[PDB]
Amino acid sequence: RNPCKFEIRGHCLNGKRCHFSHNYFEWPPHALLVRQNFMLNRILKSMDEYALGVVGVLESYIGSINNITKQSACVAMSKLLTELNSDDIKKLRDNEELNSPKIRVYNTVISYIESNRKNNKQTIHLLKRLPADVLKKTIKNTLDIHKSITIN
Amino acid sequence: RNPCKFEIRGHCLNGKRCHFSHNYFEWPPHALLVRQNFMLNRILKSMDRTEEYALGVVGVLESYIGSINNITKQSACVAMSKLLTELNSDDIKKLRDNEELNSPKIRVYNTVISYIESNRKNNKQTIHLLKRLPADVLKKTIKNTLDIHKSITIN
Amino acid sequence: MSRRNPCKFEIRGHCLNGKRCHFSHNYFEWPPHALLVRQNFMLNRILKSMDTEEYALGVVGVLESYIGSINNITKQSACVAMSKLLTELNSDDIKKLRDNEELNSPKIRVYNTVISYIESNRKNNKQTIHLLKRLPADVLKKTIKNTLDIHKSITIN
Amino acid sequence: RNPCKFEIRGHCLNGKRCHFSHNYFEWPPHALLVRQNFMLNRILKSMDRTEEYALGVVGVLESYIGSINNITKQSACVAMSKLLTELNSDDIKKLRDNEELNSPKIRVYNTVISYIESNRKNNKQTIHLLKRLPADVLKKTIKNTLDIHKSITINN
RNA sequence: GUUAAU
RNA sequence: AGUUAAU
Ligand SMILES: [Zn+2]
Ligand SMILES: [Zn+2]
Ligand SMILES: [Zn+2]
């Protein structure tokens, strides 16, 4: 009668031994919301250093701690580009008044976000061929926008 | 704990430093409804402008029809494809089926459906068509698209 | 956090107006019900993205009107209707309806021929519309009408 | 009127004969939750004996582990692949850090991940793999995974 | 004041 | 010609 906890996380695999509900019509709403988020997560994953996070991997490479190799930093960066969308960014861009230096940085990250969609495999490579000084300011500019869009 | 705002937009990338909740079970319903919409926007995008950004697509098309704001024909054919891909042919067919037959509005309802459909299969070759097509009639196929676009969303 | 009124263009997908639209495009400020319908319009775009007299009818009506040789249907147009209908049925649902009735029963071969079409067509609708464009008109009508009723069976009781 | 039960499960196909709502703007919010789950299940399915249906994939695997129900190795590998695709790597890395250094359980956790990932990339060759492992080693992989599956979902 | 799917 | 957004 209660919603099956496995169904909530995707799909019950316990055949007919399972006496919990698999009928969405019978489910309270929270279970239908929670289930939609595990399912979207699966659907998104199907279309392709751990306690630091991708962010702490990038904050460490800028700062040269925790021995982060440049290769491991462009892989992280690729992941952080996929979490940003270019329209939240184009809204930021056209609230900065004209000729502000901050417009060119905005368009620069957009080109990488867009290049990363088409193919994250060669977008990593275009980043490695950057020299670190400029790679690290690019990295720190996309960090700043990440915190900015999301918090405040 | 409160729901991690990075998680609401996708997936937190802050590792264990982040002490907000990443557990959908604890979240209030609004954060789950919001996250779902950020997530569908992301799924949809992953299967595929010089301060005319303020006009929008619709403002670029309406300035082109009226020959104002320096909207060249090329950038209005591009914008016309954007508009096509946002209409859904089904709710045109809906409207076309509410009219008496041999009303002239029916033949307008089918040029749009052929355009939204030709644009879905090939967005570009459809653009090709649009930019060779004499500005006279393109401007009324645009104004017809733009009227359907509005009326669908006005009840 | 403060509630606003939602852009009804954005509710149906993406607003194309720009800084001219003075309605909310920020989901953090919409009321629950607007977040609920957006998702439904957005799921229809996603699904559509990876797949006049006849629309009056519908697919069931153009299929039903084939059982009575009515409204000048064509075998070609009644088979497209059928695939379109199979892609609407779900392959795990008639496996429920096939594991409840007694063994050596006369309604398992229909099921398993439905199961055998539901997913012989999940692959492509070219080989499966031909797979019945050949089947005889007698067996067609009855086998077209066999899925029609599993369709309303599943959907109501 | 009440929402069309055919549109709840997808796309009503009755044309204009249908006397129920097809307008999401008018629906009670529960029907829109349900429809989304029905459509999520469909979006996801479109990205690819039989009395074993009663058993389900877990029935089938428990059965193999205990030499019950005449379950061939092929059939327990298939089902092990399906069991894998229902697991997500991130949930168990959550636990791999909750462990202590040089536990045994860090060895098992690492191994199922290698299987999830290979199962994602090529599920047909992960099955080919599982069907060459020593029968007893296969069954403990299987038992470990079943147990991870169980407590992922029931252990807060 | 002027704009408005207030 | 007042309440709500935008200037
Ligand atoms: Zn269950
Ligand atoms: Zn808008
Ligand atoms: Zn209906």
XYZ file of C-alpha atoms (C1' of nucleotides) and ligand atoms in Angstrom:
636
model
C 0.000 0.000 0.000
C 2.953 2.277 0.688
C 4.910 3.167 -2.451
C 7.713 0.738 -3.155
C 11.015 2.335 -2.251
C 12.746 0.700 -5.200
C 10.207 2.030 -7.655
C 10.811 5.519 -6.267
C 14.495 5.139 -7.267
C 13.780 3.804 -10.661
C 12.231 0.366 -11.034
C 11.341 -2.445 -8.679
C 13.257 -5.581 -9.571
C 11.635 -7.854 -6.890
C 8.943 -9.346 -9.229
C 5.616 -10.119 -7.604
C 7.064 -10.974 -4.193
C 6.855 -7.165 -3.647
C 3.709 -6.158 -1.752
C 4.368 -2.384 -1.886
C 2.689 -0.061 -4.308
C 3.825 0.292 -7.873
C 0.733 2.274 -8.894
C 1.486 5.952 -9.338
C -2.207 6.815 -8.967
C -1.999 5.438 -5.446
C 1.135 7.357 -4.394
C 1.324 10.475 -2.261
C 2.762 13.434 -4.119
C 6.167 13.642 -2.446
C 6.985 10.138 -3.736
C 6.113 11.223 -7.228
C 8.376 14.275 -6.948
C 11.283 12.309 -5.470
C 10.950 9.684 -8.159
C 10.982 12.269 -10.964
C 14.345 13.474 -9.755
C 16.038 10.051 -9.669
C 14.580 9.336 -13.124
C 15.729 12.624 -14.691
C 19.149 11.934 -13.137
C 19.265 8.509 -14.876
C 18.064 9.896 -18.170
C 20.766 12.551 -18.036
C 23.565 10.054 -17.208
C 22.538 7.872 -20.107
C 23.429 10.469 -22.758
C 27.293 10.321 -22.823
C 39.946 13.524 -5.453
C 36.334 12.544 -4.765
C 35.773 14.335 -1.464
C 37.314 17.458 -2.916
C 34.664 17.611 -5.598
C 35.123 18.898 -9.104
C 35.291 22.383 -7.496
C 38.004 21.580 -4.945
C 39.916 19.937 -7.738
C 39.891 23.228 -9.646
C 40.452 25.442 -6.558
C 43.512 23.260 -5.787
C 45.028 23.453 -9.265
C 44.794 27.276 -8.891
C 47.002 27.368 -5.851
C 49.101 24.348 -6.680
C 48.067 22.166 -3.772
C 46.871 18.489 -3.516
C 49.086 17.655 -6.562
C 46.433 18.196 -9.236
C 47.901 17.422 -12.691
C 46.935 19.745 -15.547
C 45.259 16.776 -17.306
C 43.107 16.211 -14.195
C 42.184 19.917 -14.162
C 40.849 20.141 -17.735
C 38.815 16.957 -17.071
C 37.359 18.684 -14.014
C 36.785 21.848 -15.994
C 34.877 19.958 -18.693
C 32.560 18.687 -15.990
C 32.020 22.174 -14.597
C 31.156 23.587 -18.000
C 28.383 20.937 -18.415
C 26.759 22.222 -15.218
C 26.450 25.755 -16.586
C 23.982 26.876 -19.210
C 24.769 29.666 -21.627
C 21.516 31.572 -21.284
C 21.843 32.199 -17.526
C 25.209 33.613 -18.668
C 23.883 35.822 -21.462
C 21.552 37.393 -18.943
C 24.542 38.319 -16.751
C 26.340 39.704 -19.786
C 23.666 42.247 -20.727
C 23.396 43.688 -17.256
C 27.042 44.783 -17.321
C 27.248 48.206 -18.948
C 29.064 48.648 -22.205
C 32.780 47.981 -22.718
C 33.091 46.590 -19.158
C 35.972 44.101 -19.351
C 33.629 41.474 -17.910
C 31.798 40.981 -21.212
C 34.723 39.404 -22.942
C 35.133 36.928 -20.122
C 31.449 36.064 -20.368
C 31.618 35.377 -24.100
C 34.861 33.436 -23.588
C 33.303 30.931 -21.142
C 30.228 30.646 -23.442
C 32.402 29.500 -26.347
C 33.856 26.795 -24.068
C 30.468 25.771 -22.662
C 29.220 25.477 -26.233
C 32.329 23.674 -27.444
C 31.927 21.305 -24.494
C 28.425 20.294 -25.527
C 29.353 19.472 -29.119
C 32.195 17.308 -27.871
C 33.670 17.297 -24.415
C 36.544 15.150 -25.759
C 38.237 17.797 -27.891
C 37.156 20.597 -25.562
C 39.400 19.167 -22.853
C 42.234 19.208 -25.386
C 41.758 22.836 -26.426
C 42.165 23.709 -22.712
C 45.420 21.748 -22.114
C 47.055 23.603 -25.026
C 46.393 26.761 -23.007
C 49.372 27.718 -20.834
C 48.617 27.413 -17.146
C 48.647 31.134 -16.222
C 45.733 31.728 -18.671
C 44.104 28.323 -18.052
C 43.900 29.164 -14.333
C 42.304 32.572 -14.855
C 39.815 30.990 -17.246
C 39.148 28.335 -14.570
C 38.679 30.949 -11.867
C 36.361 33.008 -14.070
C 34.003 30.058 -14.592
C 34.181 29.298 -10.859
C 33.130 32.889 -10.115
C 30.160 32.694 -12.470
C 29.210 29.284 -11.026
C 28.888 30.681 -7.500
C 27.280 33.866 -8.895
C 24.374 32.396 -10.921
C 23.570 29.924 -8.112
C 24.150 31.898 -4.856
C 23.059 35.548 -5.090
C 19.207 20.555 6.347
C 18.223 23.037 3.536
C 18.455 21.900 -0.082
C 21.759 22.588 -1.791
C 21.220 25.272 -4.431
C 23.838 23.687 -6.656
C 21.849 20.456 -6.535
C 18.652 22.274 -7.440
C 20.259 23.357 -10.701
C 21.809 20.031 -11.522
C 24.497 18.371 -9.440
C 26.621 19.850 -6.559
C 30.305 19.861 -7.443
C 31.601 20.987 -3.997
C 32.370 17.498 -2.648
C 31.984 16.943 1.089
C 32.648 20.591 1.986
C 28.921 21.178 1.143
C 26.679 20.613 4.161
C 23.374 21.321 2.515
C 20.982 18.528 1.706
C 21.487 16.495 -1.453
C 18.791 14.018 -0.494
C 15.579 14.412 -2.408
C 13.667 12.702 0.442
C 14.265 15.676 2.792
C 13.463 18.387 0.265
C 10.291 20.465 0.326
C 8.189 20.028 -2.851
C 8.998 23.351 -4.460
C 12.707 22.563 -4.681
C 11.850 19.310 -6.375
C 9.581 21.051 -8.866
C 12.215 23.673 -9.569
C 15.019 21.127 -10.008
C 12.883 19.096 -12.408
C 12.527 22.117 -14.719
C 16.267 22.932 -14.628
C 16.909 19.313 -15.388
C 14.459 18.989 -18.341
C 15.997 22.119 -19.825
C 19.316 20.334 -19.683
C 18.154 17.033 -21.195
C 16.478 18.888 -24.067
C 19.510 20.966 -24.909
C 21.844 17.965 -25.001
C 20.197 16.317 -28.031
C 21.170 18.672 -30.932
C 23.840 38.410 -30.647
C 24.947 42.090 -30.793
C 22.151 43.519 -28.517
C 19.305 42.158 -30.637
C 19.200 39.984 -27.567
C 16.733 42.554 -26.103
C 14.282 42.216 -28.982
C 14.360 38.492 -28.746
C 13.479 36.237 -31.615
C 10.007 37.733 -31.709
C 11.302 41.286 -31.680
C 13.702 40.496 -34.532
C 10.938 39.026 -36.650
C 8.577 41.937 -35.964
C 11.259 44.492 -36.735
C 12.050 42.711 -39.977
C 8.359 42.613 -41.048
C 8.216 46.379 -40.422
C 11.673 47.139 -41.887
C 13.007 48.767 -38.736
C 15.905 48.252 -36.266
C 18.366 47.179 -38.999
C 17.317 43.482 -38.997
C 18.926 42.001 -42.089
C 17.076 39.258 -43.982
C 19.671 36.608 -43.090
C 19.333 37.040 -39.334
C 15.521 37.040 -39.615
C 15.576 33.644 -41.438
C 17.754 32.215 -38.683
C 15.407 33.723 -36.078
C 12.473 32.269 -38.043
C 13.860 28.776 -37.585
C 14.230 29.332 -33.814
C 10.534 30.231 -33.757
C 9.537 27.201 -35.745
C 11.312 24.858 -33.396
C 9.320 26.266 -30.448
C 5.932 25.840 -32.008
C 4.484 22.349 -31.760
C 2.613 21.263 -34.895
C 0.001 19.418 -32.837
C -1.627 22.549 -31.383
C -1.850 24.059 -34.874
C -3.637 20.960 -36.145
C -5.863 21.384 -33.128
C -6.778 24.938 -34.182
C -7.078 24.077 -37.890
C -9.658 21.412 -36.954
C -11.919 24.014 -35.227
C -12.773 25.853 -38.457
C -15.354 25.452 -41.200
C -13.710 23.980 -44.270
C -12.677 26.142 -47.252
C -12.084 28.970 -44.817
C -8.811 30.549 -46.055
C -7.267 30.290 -42.568
C -6.816 26.568 -43.213
C -4.212 27.066 -45.901
C -2.240 29.341 -43.606
C -2.325 26.697 -40.851
C -0.659 24.168 -43.199
C 2.253 26.270 -44.489
C 3.313 26.702 -40.818
C 3.014 22.979 -40.130
C 5.092 22.238 -43.259
C 7.665 24.760 -42.097
C 7.871 23.597 -38.481
C 8.125 20.052 -39.900
C 10.665 20.809 -42.587
C 12.627 22.733 -39.968
C 12.561 19.809 -37.506
C 14.131 17.350 -39.930
C 16.671 19.764 -41.407
C 16.860 23.089 -39.596
C 19.403 24.424 -42.113
C 18.135 23.406 -45.602
C 14.839 24.761 -44.329
C 16.817 28.028 -43.577
C 18.113 27.818 -47.175
C 14.569 27.829 -48.506
C 13.624 30.741 -46.266
C 16.433 33.070 -47.424
C 15.812 32.562 -51.175
C 12.045 33.014 -50.753
C 10.956 36.552 -51.894
C 10.783 39.042 -49.021
C 7.149 39.812 -49.862
C 5.781 36.413 -48.881
C 8.347 35.493 -46.231
C 7.207 38.565 -44.299
C 3.637 37.265 -44.287
C 4.621 33.667 -43.512
C 6.523 35.214 -40.587
C 3.584 37.326 -39.507
C 1.372 34.237 -39.760
C 3.733 32.140 -37.647
C 3.947 35.008 -35.167
C 0.148 35.247 -34.915
C -0.267 31.548 -34.254
C 2.557 31.673 -31.698
C 0.669 34.379 -29.786
C -2.810 32.922 -30.043
C -1.769 29.437 -28.887
C -0.466 30.967 -25.685
C -3.476 33.394 -25.297
C -5.891 30.653 -24.232
C 11.526 33.380 -3.405
C 8.923 36.067 -3.801
C 6.074 34.881 -5.990
C 5.652 36.478 -9.382
C 3.487 35.761 -12.350
C 4.919 33.191 -14.773
C 5.652 33.861 -18.370
C 3.094 31.657 -20.187
C 5.488 31.481 -23.124
C 8.111 29.937 -20.831
C 5.458 27.612 -19.409
C 5.274 26.078 -22.889
C 9.057 25.882 -23.317
C 11.260 28.938 -23.906
C 10.190 32.621 -24.089
C 11.300 34.289 -27.311
C 10.462 37.935 -26.415
C 13.544 39.006 -24.402
C 13.977 41.878 -22.001
C 10.529 43.071 -23.296
C 8.668 40.327 -21.366
C 7.974 41.503 -17.817
C 6.904 38.115 -16.519
C 8.878 35.604 -14.534
C 11.350 33.314 -16.261
C 12.809 32.319 -12.849
C 11.481 28.955 -11.630
C 12.405 29.771 -7.980
C 9.484 32.313 -8.016
C 6.711 30.382 -9.833
C 3.751 28.733 -8.093
C 3.728 24.922 -7.963
C 1.099 24.426 -10.604
C 3.054 26.354 -13.204
C 6.110 24.242 -12.480
C 3.919 21.191 -12.985
C 2.547 22.085 -16.427
C 5.898 23.271 -17.815
C 7.359 19.816 -17.099
C 4.526 18.196 -19.012
C 5.010 20.455 -22.032
C 8.792 19.882 -21.743
C 8.427 16.084 -21.572
C 6.352 16.181 -24.705
C 9.118 18.127 -26.486
C 11.759 15.657 -25.308
C 9.840 12.594 -26.357
C 8.857 14.083 -29.720
C 12.547 15.066 -30.192
C 13.785 11.405 -30.120
C 11.129 9.519 -32.119
C -6.759 17.122 -41.568
C -9.811 14.822 -41.863
C -7.765 11.994 -40.262
C -6.857 14.149 -37.213
C -10.552 14.765 -36.609
C -10.700 10.987 -36.213
C -7.562 10.235 -34.265
C -5.528 7.082 -34.560
C -8.193 4.914 -32.865
C -10.850 6.398 -35.112
C -8.831 5.772 -38.271
C -8.211 2.249 -37.008
C -11.804 1.594 -35.895
C -13.044 3.006 -39.172
C -10.839 0.403 -40.872
C -12.724 -2.498 -39.245
C -15.877 -1.217 -40.976
C -14.211 -0.183 -44.268
C -15.354 3.389 -43.719
C -14.254 6.958 -44.537
C -12.109 5.715 -47.446
C -9.165 4.486 -45.364
C -6.163 2.925 -47.068
C -4.314 -0.163 -45.871
C -1.189 2.051 -46.050
C -2.604 4.670 -43.685
C -4.113 2.086 -41.320
C -0.742 0.445 -40.737
C 1.092 3.664 -39.855
C -1.819 4.225 -37.431
C -1.084 0.811 -35.950
C 2.630 1.306 -35.294
C 1.860 4.757 -33.854
C -0.527 2.894 -31.567
C 2.015 0.239 -30.604
C 4.541 2.875 -29.591
C 1.817 4.177 -27.292
C 1.389 0.829 -25.526
C 3.976 -0.245 -22.926
C 5.719 -3.697 -23.124
C 5.721 -4.393 -19.381
C 1.958 -3.939 -18.987
C 0.671 -6.906 -21.001
C 3.274 -9.036 -19.242
C 1.198 -8.352 -16.177
C -1.961 -9.168 -18.171
C -0.342 -12.392 -19.496
C 0.927 -13.730 -16.130
C -2.505 -13.722 -14.399
C -4.686 -16.028 -16.569
C -4.546 -19.815 -16.476
C -2.022 -21.864 -18.427
C -3.010 -23.348 -21.779
C -5.513 -20.520 -22.336
C -6.705 -18.963 -25.618
C -5.502 -15.384 -24.845
C -1.746 -15.669 -24.521
C -0.929 -15.915 -28.217
C -2.740 -12.620 -28.837
C -0.767 -11.067 -25.967
C 2.507 -12.553 -27.109
C 1.747 -11.382 -30.659
C 1.035 -7.947 -29.182
C 4.222 -8.173 -27.096
C 5.842 -9.340 -30.344
C 4.649 -6.205 -32.140
C 4.907 -3.638 -29.332
C 8.682 -4.140 -29.360
C 9.239 -5.445 -32.886
C 8.225 -1.825 -33.502
C 10.133 -0.163 -30.657
C 13.090 -0.693 -32.999
C 11.714 0.868 -36.159
C 8.306 1.377 -37.714
C 9.448 0.697 -41.298
C 9.958 -3.059 -40.959
C 6.894 -3.383 -38.699
C 4.429 -1.480 -40.923
C 5.551 -3.768 -43.779
C 5.211 -6.780 -41.425
C 1.430 -6.262 -41.489
C 1.064 -4.499 -44.855
C 1.567 -8.103 -46.052
C -0.650 -9.881 -43.479
C -4.109 -10.702 -44.879
C -7.020 -8.276 -44.509
C -8.986 -10.847 -42.507
C -6.273 -11.359 -39.878
C -5.296 -7.679 -39.995
C -8.681 -6.304 -38.940
C -8.893 -8.842 -36.081
C -5.226 -8.372 -34.949
C -5.554 -4.556 -35.357
C -8.691 -4.872 -33.225
C -6.894 -7.134 -30.741
C -4.469 -4.427 -29.640
C -7.211 -1.770 -29.629
C -8.924 -3.532 -26.789
C -5.803 -4.254 -24.769
C -5.277 -0.508 -25.150
C -8.596 0.405 -23.469
C -8.316 -2.547 -21.052
C -5.010 -1.284 -19.560
C -6.013 2.341 -19.507
C -9.283 2.105 -17.425
C -9.890 -0.768 -14.972
C -14.015 17.426 -16.703
C -11.677 14.780 -15.384
C -8.279 14.395 -17.084
C -8.084 11.963 -19.964
C -6.668 8.719 -18.656
C -4.982 8.141 -22.056
C -3.171 11.478 -21.877
C -2.120 10.724 -18.321
C -0.210 7.692 -19.670
C 1.093 9.437 -22.751
C -0.826 10.886 -25.705
C -4.560 10.288 -26.065
C -5.356 8.878 -29.483
C -9.194 9.207 -29.528
C -9.144 12.507 -31.535
C -11.957 14.973 -30.828
C -14.389 12.196 -29.811
C -12.725 12.285 -26.361
C -14.774 14.127 -23.725
C -12.069 14.489 -21.023
C -9.398 17.104 -20.363
C -6.257 17.269 -22.498
C -5.267 20.688 -21.178
C -2.560 20.468 -18.553
C -3.518 23.963 -17.408
C -6.772 22.541 -15.997
C -5.586 19.480 -14.222
C -5.394 18.716 -10.541
C -1.681 18.596 -9.607
C -1.721 14.878 -8.842
C -2.534 13.969 -12.385
C 0.451 15.977 -13.580
C 2.820 14.152 -11.198
C 1.519 10.814 -12.485
C 1.779 11.735 -16.109
C 5.380 12.796 -15.629
C 6.343 9.476 -14.110
C 4.555 7.665 -17.030
C 6.415 9.809 -19.521
C 9.785 9.579 -17.728
C 9.483 5.800 -17.894
C 8.837 6.116 -21.611
C 11.679 8.523 -22.395
C 14.055 6.173 -20.580
C 12.861 2.938 -22.269
C 13.532 4.574 -25.621
C 17.287 4.547 -24.834
C 18.241 0.800 -24.962
C 11.973 -18.967 -20.635
C 9.695 -16.286 -19.138
C 7.853 -17.659 -16.022
C 10.815 -15.805 -14.442
C 8.596 -12.697 -14.644
C 7.011 -13.781 -11.361
C 10.491 -13.769 -9.881
C 11.741 -10.501 -11.254
C 15.419 -9.776 -11.638
C 16.118 -10.128 -7.907
C 14.076 -13.287 -7.592
C 16.151 -14.698 -10.424
C 19.442 -13.822 -8.814
C 18.714 -15.019 -5.327
C 17.575 -18.214 -7.028
C 20.844 -18.677 -8.880
C 22.793 -18.026 -5.677
C 20.952 -20.828 -3.924
C 20.723 -23.266 -6.845
C 16.943 -22.931 -6.991
C 14.461 -22.741 -9.888
C 16.787 -24.059 -12.655
C 18.358 -20.742 -13.464
C 21.113 -20.986 -16.109
C 24.282 -18.911 -15.797
C 23.368 -16.947 -18.915
C 20.045 -15.973 -17.405
C 21.668 -14.801 -14.142
C 24.217 -12.664 -16.044
C 21.538 -10.878 -18.076
C 19.658 -10.205 -14.894
C 22.880 -9.112 -13.172
C 23.396 -6.565 -15.938
C 19.852 -5.282 -15.410
C 20.514 -5.169 -11.687
C 23.633 -3.107 -12.360
C 21.866 -0.547 -14.618
C 19.543 0.257 -11.647
C 22.451 1.171 -9.502
C 24.223 4.523 -9.714
C 27.943 4.827 -9.034
C 27.732 8.022 -6.963
C 25.575 6.514 -4.151
C 28.198 3.911 -3.284
C 31.191 6.232 -3.472
C 29.187 8.039 -0.785
C 29.655 4.866 1.217
C 33.190 4.072 0.112
C 34.260 7.236 1.988
C 32.069 6.336 5.003
C 34.240 3.199 5.313
C 37.551 2.781 7.206
C 40.971 2.461 5.586
C 41.860 -1.064 4.459
C 38.496 -2.575 5.095
C 37.593 -5.527 2.896
C 34.401 -3.710 1.946
C 36.428 -1.121 0.117
C 37.546 -3.945 -2.175
C 33.971 -5.034 -3.009
C 32.654 -1.492 -3.538
C 35.458 -0.762 -6.035
C 34.610 -3.946 -7.935
C 30.879 -3.380 -8.393
C 31.679 0.136 -9.746
C 33.929 -1.380 -12.367
C 30.885 -3.475 -13.321
C 28.320 -0.626 -13.289
C 30.552 1.471 -15.543
C 31.351 -1.344 -17.954
C 27.652 -2.199 -17.876
C 26.772 1.365 -18.885
C 29.336 1.560 -21.662
C 28.780 -1.927 -23.126
C 26.177 -4.042 -21.322
C 26.517 -6.892 -23.887
C 30.230 -7.434 -23.170
C 29.868 -7.039 -19.401
C 27.476 -9.971 -19.727
C 30.001 -11.855 -21.807
C 32.485 -11.176 -18.992
C 30.299 -12.332 -16.111
C 29.608 -15.654 -17.916
C 33.333 -16.636 -17.779
C 33.941 -16.000 -14.087
C 34.171 -19.027 -11.791
C 30.630 -19.916 -10.708
C 31.401 -19.355 -7.039
C 33.049 -15.985 -7.683
C 30.102 -14.896 -9.798
C 27.675 -15.712 -7.018
C 29.475 -13.514 -4.506
C 29.717 -10.575 -6.864
C 25.939 -11.201 -7.234
C 25.375 -11.495 -3.510
C 27.441 -8.382 -2.792
C 25.555 -6.365 -5.364
C 22.171 -7.554 -4.200
C 23.125 -6.481 -0.758
C 24.364 -3.082 -1.866
C 21.116 -2.661 -3.856
C 19.124 -3.527 -0.736
C 20.767 -1.062 1.702
C 21.304 1.822 -0.716
C 17.489 2.079 -0.673
C 16.682 1.115 2.975
C 19.631 2.536 5.041
C 19.570 6.221 6.061
C 2.473 60.308 -14.872
C 3.108 56.661 -18.703
C 3.262 51.190 -20.057
C 0.138 46.080 -19.144
C -1.409 38.282 -20.620
C -2.041 43.838 -13.139
C -8.800 57.199 -11.571
C -6.556 53.721 -6.337
C -3.855 47.634 -5.551
C 0.613 44.743 -8.115
C 5.022 44.424 -11.874
C 8.117 47.533 -15.128
C 10.207 52.738 -16.002
Zn 8.508 -3.141 -5.474
Zn 8.591 35.578 -21.399
Zn -8.453 11.720 -24.526
